[PDB]
Design a binder for this molecule. Sequence first.
Ligand code: GDP
Ligand code: MG
Length: 174
Amino acid sequence: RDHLFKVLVVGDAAVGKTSLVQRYSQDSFSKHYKSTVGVDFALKVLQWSDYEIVRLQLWDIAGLERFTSMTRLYYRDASAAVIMFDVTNATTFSNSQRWKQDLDSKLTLPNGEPVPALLLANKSDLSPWAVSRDQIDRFSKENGFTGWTETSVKENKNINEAMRVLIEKMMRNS
Ligand SMILES: Nc1nc2c(ncn2[C@@H]2O[C@H](COP(=O)(O)OP(=O)(O)O)[C@@H](O)[C@H]2O)c(=O)[nH]1
Ligand SMILES: [Mg+2]
């Protein structure tokens, strides 16, 4: 059995989105697949059990990231969103509210419920931050995120584990 999940990686310019996809996709292991799959997204494939795999399409909002509003070809049929901000740039934090409001205005799961949304406070390795952890938690709750965590794509801190718990949630919602 194959479980296919389209995951949106959204957030303002310069927060670390392309770096997250480059680290977490399979592209540092093999890119042979791109010639027939294309490049709208990057893949990651994981064995899930003896008879099941999980396949993730990682969609980077990329060229339209500064518009803070997703287009239909980008968001359609997604199973989750990773909304990234830079802890050192409060504008990217504030704009995560606009990204989340846009997601919920555009997309639900097939059952009509909201898509899971994981808020990543990225660049946690830098100092000082422009927001506090208590501020992030209140913001995550007030805006209806599934949860939040700090990450450093640069130091590979919390990346794999944050994505892993999101996969497990997408499997539960399947
Ligand atoms: N210090 C630090 N730099 C990061 C981190 N993640 C990304 N960067 C850097 O931030 C810059 C922008 O990253 P990029 O992935 O292009 O951001 P995007 O514009 O959201 O795609 C690059 O120089 C990255 O190396 C992080 O966790 N910590
Ligand atoms: Mg980018």
